[PDB]
Homo-oligomer: A and B are copies of this chain.
């Protein structure tokens, strides 16, 4: 319980660095730079360099995906660490590449791939190990085949590497490029629960033989058709170590009740014959078409053979079924009940923070440039799902191919070489490919996190007591923000969640006037979209559409009933905005619907930005058009092309016509 560490995820995806807690390293006589022997299971062991990282837990150790596969261990297992002082540098180490990775790529694995790996990098060696080198639009696994000083060699600039030879084979070594948790970004929190409910029925299939508890059995994934579904299940079963069969919807419908009734039974029989079963019902929208009263006799039996095959079967037999649909409202209601799909999982469009991680993952095999600032691209990529974030990663890597052809001609079948690596991908390959931009998820209810500073407010002493830490031993839950326009009513609730650390949903009046108003309308889709997100603030601007001048005066009443009931939720709040508080029906003001009213001294301080092309105030006070005078001041950019930034003589020309 003191040396027994639990393997965890790696902050840095390095095959040699494993991070640990320093107070635990203070117990086991270790500091940075020293090497440690780590043996996990099946008598296998490797050896790596430690580091003092206080981020990890005390009884937990950080291990990388390739470090995990070398010990024949997987995440959630206990490993033992031993001090390794008896180690010395090595003379010769023979490195052969792996068969399943040298696909057409040729040249010299040492000059292109292996040199940058070990250049000034001091790394330990095993006699029988495998490892991955990400470079040149791909990744070629290598194998250590010999070790000169016993089995614990250490590479250094003083080392002779005879990489000459044949592509060695692999032996029960799962592809180190297979899907993993380090390959799924933008849904870290979404992976928390899915990894808290499949962690036991798959990794610990012991208690579930002798416990009367009914374990989770029916998982229902949903989200965007663009991305975020197949990998959520692929990165789990391929990483947790579970048998993975993914039944595709379109194939089943391609029969005449032949492989429609068989593959449904057979794959349900096949997955159960193995102990860890993960069944991915891809395109369940095509199989289950909600309550389709007008259809053919095959959909009335392909869904009729599915429910009976999961309530009778899939009962403590260590089988976790996983559905996948574009919308959780186009499949039969009898799918989500008890035992079958009682679990549901939201896959939302990645926020600005989540877009950056997935950008990193896919942009790893490439060699980029320092002018490339993927952070700036990670901001202006709303409406972009993991597919489109990978779709431009192709058009960004492929634009570098034609733009740098030139001398290379008469391409051989295996012409790739060191030219493939070091292929610097300029930022223009992004911009020109992003010039033909094409997003997908634009009409969606976006879940994200506000990244705006509270300094740019200049308010009127907003009482801090309009907040709570969910620690009490009833509280008001309805507030509205009215007053003049521009004073801050739109950006007001944005900076509140900056300190509260909660998701937000910006909704407008005519947004609820969606043609898809025919109870679980978008109105209720938006309500329940923020129900899973806990806590979540529902901001509503343009609420002036409450009055008159079909379902004209409807949707309001529709909005009314849904507001109540949320008072028991406690961890959810509703805020609105308006400018003409007269034509609004006073219904919302009623207790429960809303329970507070906030207006909007003198002109307050306001924090600007863009302080680089700036040039050096409160007297002008003698917001409304705060940004309007700012952008026009930047628009007054002197074009004396044939130094100057901002100036005063340009302000006086702006207030001549403003209002």
**Which A residues contact B (CB, under 8 angstroms)?**
465, 468, 472, 474-476, 595, 628, 631, 634-636
Contacts of A631 in B (CB 8 A): 474-476
Chain B residue with Cβ nearest A473: B634
Q: Are B465 and A628 in contact (CB under 8 A)?
A: no
A472 — which chain B residues lie within 8 A by C-beta?
A: 634
Q: 5 extra interchain contacts, Cβ-Cβ under 8 A, other than A468-B635, A474-B631?
A: A465-B635, A472-B634, A475-B631, A476-B631, A595-B628
Chain B residues with Cβ below 8 Å from A635 are: 465, 468, 475
* 10 closest cross-chain pairs (CB), A and B: A465-B635, A475-B631, A476-B631, A474-B631, A465-B636, A595-B628, A476-B628, A472-B634, A475-B635, A468-B635
Q: How far is the CB of A627 from chain B (nearest CB, A)?
A: 8
A464 to chain B, nearest CB (A): 10
Number of copies: 2
A-B contact pairs, 10 of them (CB 8 A): A465-B635, A465-B636, A468-B635, A472-B634, A474-B631, A475-B631, A475-B635, A476-B628, A476-B631, A595-B628
Q: Nearest Cβ in chain B — how far from A625, in angstroms?
A: 10
* Residue of A472, A475, A634, A635 with most chain B CB atoms under a 10 A cut-off: A635
Enumerate chain B residues within 8 angstroms of A476, measured Cβ to Cβ.
628, 631
Could you tell me the distance in whole angstroms from the C-beta of A596 to the nearest C-beta in chain B?
Answer: 9
Chain B residue numbers with a CB within 8 Å of A475 are: 631, 635
* Smallest CB gap from A634: residue in B: B472
| Cβ distance A481 to chain B, nearest Cβ, rounded Å | 16
Select from chain B the residue with minimum beta-carbon distance to A475. Answer: B631
A635–B635 Cα distance when bound, in Å, is: 48
User: Within the complex, what minimum Cβ distance (angstroms) separates A649 from chain B?
Assistant: 15
Q: Which residue of chain B has its CB nearest to the CB of A464?
A: B639
In whole angstroms, how far apart are the Cα atoms of A628 and B631 in the complex? 42
* A474: B residues at CB distance < 8 A: 631
Residues of the B chain whose Cβ atoms lie less than 8 Å from the Cβ of A636 = 465
Q: Which residues on the B side are within 8 Å of A465 (C-beta)?
A: 635-636
A628 surroundings in chain B (CB, below 8 A) = 476, 595
A465's nearest neighbour on chain B, judged by CB, is: B635
**Complex Cα gap A631–B634 (Å):** 46
Nearest CB of B to A658, in Å: 11
- Of chain B, the residue at the smallest CB distance from A596 is B628
The residues of B that contact A595 with a CB separation of less than 8 Å are 628
